[PDB]
Design an enzyme around this catalytic site. Structure first.
Site, PDB file in Angstrom:
ATOM      1  N   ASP A  88      26.750 138.003  23.777  1.00 30.68           N
ATOM      2  CA  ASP A  88      27.610 139.224  23.626  1.00 30.68           C
ATOM      3  C   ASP A  88      28.763 139.035  22.678  1.00 30.68           C
ATOM      4  O   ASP A  88      29.070 139.889  21.848  1.00 30.68           O
ATOM      5  CB  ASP A  88      28.586 139.219  24.839  1.00 30.68           C
ATOM      6  CG  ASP A  88      27.838 139.775  26.344  1.00 30.68           C
ATOM      7  OD1 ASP A  88      26.593 140.308  26.077  1.00 30.68           O
ATOM      8  OD2 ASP A  88      28.136 139.281  27.239  1.00 30.68           O
ATOM      9  N   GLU A  97      24.351 132.385  40.451  1.00 30.63           N
ATOM     10  CA  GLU A  97      24.229 133.828  40.891  1.00 30.63           C
ATOM     11  C   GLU A  97      22.888 134.197  41.197  1.00 30.63           C
ATOM     12  O   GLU A  97      22.009 134.163  40.503  1.00 30.63           O
ATOM     13  CB  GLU A  97      24.739 134.767  39.521  1.00 30.63           C
ATOM     14  CG  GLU A  97      24.730 136.140  39.886  1.00 30.63           C
ATOM     15  CD  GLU A  97      25.136 136.932  39.061  1.00 30.63           C
ATOM     16  OE1 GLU A  97      25.202 138.260  38.936  1.00 30.63           O
ATOM     17  OE2 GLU A  97      26.009 136.620  38.069  1.00 30.63           O
ATOM     18  N   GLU A 150      26.731 138.389  44.252  1.00 30.05           N
ATOM     19  CA  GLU A 150      26.899 139.888  43.796  1.00 30.05           C
ATOM     20  C   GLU A 150      26.567 140.833  44.897  1.00 30.05           C
ATOM     21  O   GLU A 150      25.662 140.772  45.263  1.00 30.05           O
ATOM     22  CB  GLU A 150      25.949 140.342  42.348  1.00 30.05           C
ATOM     23  CG  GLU A 150      26.435 141.606  41.785  1.00 30.05           C
ATOM     24  CD  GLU A 150      25.524 141.857  40.744  1.00 30.05           C
ATOM     25  OE1 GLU A 150      25.400 141.281  39.589  1.00 30.05           O
ATOM     26  OE2 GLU A 150      25.009 143.011  40.639  1.00 30.05           O
ATOM     27  N   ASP A 165      18.213 147.387  40.463  1.00 30.73           N
ATOM     28  CA  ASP A 165      19.662 146.816  40.542  1.00 30.73           C
ATOM     29  C   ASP A 165      20.563 148.037  39.704  1.00 30.73           C
ATOM     30  O   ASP A 165      20.438 148.254  38.511  1.00 30.73           O
ATOM     31  CB  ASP A 165      19.787 145.429  39.762  1.00 30.73           C
ATOM     32  CG  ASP A 165      21.082 145.056  39.526  1.00 30.73           C
ATOM     33  OD1 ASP A 165      21.713 145.048  40.723  1.00 30.73           O
ATOM     34  OD2 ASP A 165      21.214 144.296  38.601  1.00 30.73           O
ATOM     35  N   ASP A 200      30.973 143.298  37.856  1.00 30.97           N
ATOM     36  CA  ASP A 200      29.857 143.554  37.116  1.00 30.97           C
ATOM     37  C   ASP A 200      29.167 144.724  37.363  1.00 30.97           C
ATOM     38  O   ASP A 200      28.441 144.822  38.162  1.00 30.97           O
ATOM     39  CB  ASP A 200      28.958 142.174  37.371  1.00 30.97           C
ATOM     40  CG  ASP A 200      27.362 142.060  36.605  1.00 30.97           C
ATOM     41  OD1 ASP A 200      27.694 143.066  35.555  1.00 30.97           O
ATOM     42  OD2 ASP A 200      26.588 141.721  37.060  1.00 30.97           O
TER      43      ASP A 200
HETATM   44  O1  LIG Z   1      25.350 135.839  34.948  1.00 24.51           O
HETATM   45  C1  LIG Z   1      26.034 136.869  34.182  1.00 24.51           C
HETATM   46  C2  LIG Z   1      25.448 138.186  34.318  1.00 24.51           C
HETATM   47  O2  LIG Z   1      24.223 138.091  33.457  1.00 24.51           O
HETATM   48  C3  LIG Z   1      23.466 139.533  33.310  1.00 24.51           C
HETATM   49  O3  LIG Z   1      24.081 140.561  32.711  1.00 24.51           O
HETATM   50  C4  LIG Z   1      23.135 139.754  34.892  1.00 24.51           C
HETATM   51  O4  LIG Z   1      22.658 140.947  34.759  1.00 24.51           O
HETATM   52  C5  LIG Z   1      24.433 139.933  35.564  1.00 24.51           C
HETATM   53  O5  LIG Z   1      24.100 139.988  37.065  1.00 24.51           O
HETATM   54  C6  LIG Z   1      25.066 138.562  35.916  1.00 24.51           C
HETATM   55  O6  LIG Z   1      26.409 138.596  36.553  1.00 24.51           O
HETATM   56 CO   LIG Z   2      23.336 143.674  39.396  1.00 27.30          CO
HETATM   57 MG   LIG Z   3      26.022 140.075  38.153  1.00 33.16          MG
END
Ligand SMILES: OC[C@H]1O[C@H](O)[C@H](O)[C@@H](O)[C@@H]1O
Ligand SMILES: [Co+2]
Ligand SMILES: [Mg+2]
Length: 387
Positions: A56, A180, A216, A254, A286
């Site tokens: 990012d 996660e 999540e 999702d 998120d």
């Molecule tokens: O791991 C950090 C993030 O990475 C990605 O964007 C996943 O879609 C999200 O669910 C997660 O929290």
């Molecule tokens: Co998600």
């Molecule tokens: Mg997430």
């Protein structure tokens, strides 16, 4: 009211407000955002901090020179605003090299690359002040049964996380890991698909104290599971290091809706639990502003995340503070649940004729639990109808 301030610990991923709106059937509907602009705009909304994947912040393939100038610009914006970076993570899912996974790719050279890419971003995360490093194994899995030996894959997953723990330990870093879970998407089935599977896996790592979970809302709901229950088990085990807040309407793709949307009662019981247990970590959103929205709708959706948390916090507090609710909790024997079943010990229990031989099973069975009146008081408080 319900105005967020930095004390509320609300955080956002760069990839959330920065989502351009590309989905499996459509091109992007919004232009790319400069991370510097996101930091400043989130600071204006009252956010506490931001989070990021390596990719990012630094475009993939960037030279050492370009990488330095991306980080410099970003840190200047953090310095100007006082915004914090409490968590960071690695993108091990976008580039085609990760199409069969990162840590559990069948190709060994890919797995080694995945580890080096991750280790490089831990160094940056620690430099920026992150306390938690999240791992989302989005590509670790399979669409077909023969493609992945799951026992060998778990060996490789354990090997990777053990090496990361050896790395942070050898560097003396004060950062912890959070796994996660997600049950499926983009793979047909993803390894460690729920909070439970991730908690169980952590107990087989060499240094289990360094690892917890980043559950999540929407991901557990994609399995039809009760998210507050799963959070309760994570807290019970001492493993709730971080949390992803958003909304999801049932079992489907999702959605990453803004928090409060989706299952609203589940959001209420979630906030009730987090606040009453004293969770002190970030309240991290998120979420994806729907691709129907322009940039004004992006910031309205982000503001709504924080607003809905603050409303639910108020309603759950009033629920727990209401003497009529306290009376209802006693009528449903929530207080007896807290008492030990047999603190008198096993032998005393075996010789207690009132526990079996002389136990009046029909009188006990006749007692109503009074759960419906308690739940209607909870509904009344959520809706602000106590009048
Ligand atoms: O791991 C950090 C993030 O990475 C990605 O964007 C996943 O879609 C999200 O669910 C997660 O929290
Ligand atoms: Co998600
Ligand atoms: Mg997430």
């Amino acid at each position: 009211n319900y105005q967020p301030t930095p004390e509320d610990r609300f955080t956002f991923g760069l990839w959330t407000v920065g989502w351009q709106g590309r989905d499996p059937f459509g091109d992007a509907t919004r232009r790319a955002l400069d991370p510097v602009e996101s930091v400043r705009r989130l600071a204006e909304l009252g956010a506490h901090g931001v989070t990021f994947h390596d990719d990012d912040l630094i475009p993939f393939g960037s030279s050492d020179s370009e990488r330095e100038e991306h980080v410099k610009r970003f840190r200047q914006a953090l310095d100007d605003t006082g915004m914090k970076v409490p968590m960071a993570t690695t993108n091990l899912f976008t580039h085609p090299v990760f199409k069969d996974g990162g840590f559990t790719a069948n190709d060994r050279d890919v797995r080694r690359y995945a580890l080096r890419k991750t280790i490089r971003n831990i160094d940056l995360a620690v430099e920026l002040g992150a306390e938690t490093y999240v791992a989302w194994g989005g590509r670790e899995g399979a669409e077909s049964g023969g493609a992945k030996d799951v026992r060998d894959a778990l060996d490789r997953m354990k090997e990777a996380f053990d090496l990361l723990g050896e790395y942070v330990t050898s560097q003396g870093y004060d950062i912890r890991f959070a796994i996660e879970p997600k049950p499926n998407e983009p793979r047909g089935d993803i390894l460690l698909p729920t909070v439970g599977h991730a908690l169980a896996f952590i107990e087989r790592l060499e240094r289990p104290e360094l690892y917890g979970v980043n559950p999540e809302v929407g991901h557990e709901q994609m399995a039809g599971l009760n998210f507050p229950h799963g959070i309760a088990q994570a807290l019970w085990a001492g493993k709730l290091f971080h949390i992803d807040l958003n909304g999801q309407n049932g079992i489907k793709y999702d959605q990453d809706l803004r928090f409060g949307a989706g299952d609203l009662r589940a959001a209420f019981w979630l906030v009730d639990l987090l606040e009453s247990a004293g969770y002190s970590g970030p309240r991290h959103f998120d979420f994806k502003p729907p691709r129907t929205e322009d940039f004004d709708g992006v910031w309205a959706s982000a503001a709504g995340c924080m607003r809905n948390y603050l409303i639910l916090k108020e309603r759950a507090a009033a629920f727990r503070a209401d003497p009529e609710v306290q009376e209802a909790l006693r009528a449903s024997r929530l207080d007896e649940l807290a008492r030990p079943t047999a603190a008198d010990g096993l032998q005393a229990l075996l010789d207690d004729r009132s526990a079996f031989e002389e136990f009046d099973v029909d009188a006990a069975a006749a007692r109503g639990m009074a759960f419906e009146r308690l739940d209607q008081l909870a509904m009344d408080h959520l809706l602000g109808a106590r009048g």
